[PDB]
């Protein structure tokens, strides 16, 4: 049935809580799976002058957004799949499931 679930958040511990509760659900239902593949986090850098105006010493500022991405592949019936998507959601965490 071969679903993938990807989790593409910024909050690492919320993300890991979601991954953890999902995998323990998987093993209590006895579902084989490829474990949490932790993709390389990607750092949206933005470099700007601190100043609005032009004068001053040329001081710069690198703001960063860390995006942490994980995914898990499951083999399971669609009933457990749909209730899985019904459960295991958090604030500040974007999830998407995909079949095949």
């Amino acid at each position: 049935i071969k679903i993938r679930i990807t989790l593409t958040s910024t909050k690492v511990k919320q993300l890991e809580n979601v991954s953890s509760n999902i995998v323990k659900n998987a093993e209590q239902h006895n579902l084989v799976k490829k474990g949490p593949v932790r993709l390389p986090t990607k750092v949206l850098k933005i470099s700007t002058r601190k100043t609005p105006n032009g004068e001053g010493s040329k001081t710069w500022e690198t703001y960063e957004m860390r995006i942490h991405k994980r995914y898990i592949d499951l083999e399971a019936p669609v009933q457990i799949v749909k209730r899985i998507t019904q459960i295991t959601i958090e604030p500040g965490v974007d999830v998407e499931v995909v079949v095949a």
Partner: protein
């Protein structure tokens, strides 16, 4: 069908625009911030404020019109967006609530020192470890100069 990077920065921009809209509109209700939770079947927006009765209005009229405004601007479908309001924990521990309180006091005509000392007293009595209130601008003078009121201890680093 959008990149995850652009998805998340658009989420942040959505949060920021909502925050500025609410702090422009609900200044007089004690708007002390907001949260957003995406979900299947909907996205929900949890306002945290003080005057929940005024944010609600009669029969939720204001919640209704604000929900519809958000829907109309961010082009959500009717029902895909939900708003909840919540009586915020720890009113004294809100940097913005006390700020807007100072704003309304000074605008109704209270004095600078009376207002700031009342605020810092309320904060430190509300279980805070320290506070610091600064008032810059024109104070009884053409020349501008700052006042700094404090209590407890703060850190800066």
């Amino acid at each position: 069908l959008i990149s995850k990077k652009r998805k998340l920065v658009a989420d942040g921009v959505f949060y920021a625009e909502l925050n500025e809209f609410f702090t422009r509109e609900l200044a007089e209700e004690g708007y002390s911030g907001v949260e957003v939770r995406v979900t299947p079947t909907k996205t929900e927006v949890i306002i945290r404020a003080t005057r929940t009765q005024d944010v609600l209005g009669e029969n939720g009229r204001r919640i209704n019109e604000l929900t519809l405004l958000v829907q109309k601007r961010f082009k959500y479908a009717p029902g895909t967006i939900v708003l909840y309001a919540e009586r915020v924990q720890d009113r004294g521990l809100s940097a913005v609530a006390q700020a807007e309180s100072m704003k309304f006091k000074l605008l109704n005509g209270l004095a600078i020192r009376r207002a700031a000392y009342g605020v810092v007293r309320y904060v430190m009595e509300s279980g805070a470890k320290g506070c610091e209130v600064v008032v810059s601008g024109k104070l009884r003078a053409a020349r501008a100069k700052a006042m700094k009121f404090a209590d407890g201890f703060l850190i800066h680093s």
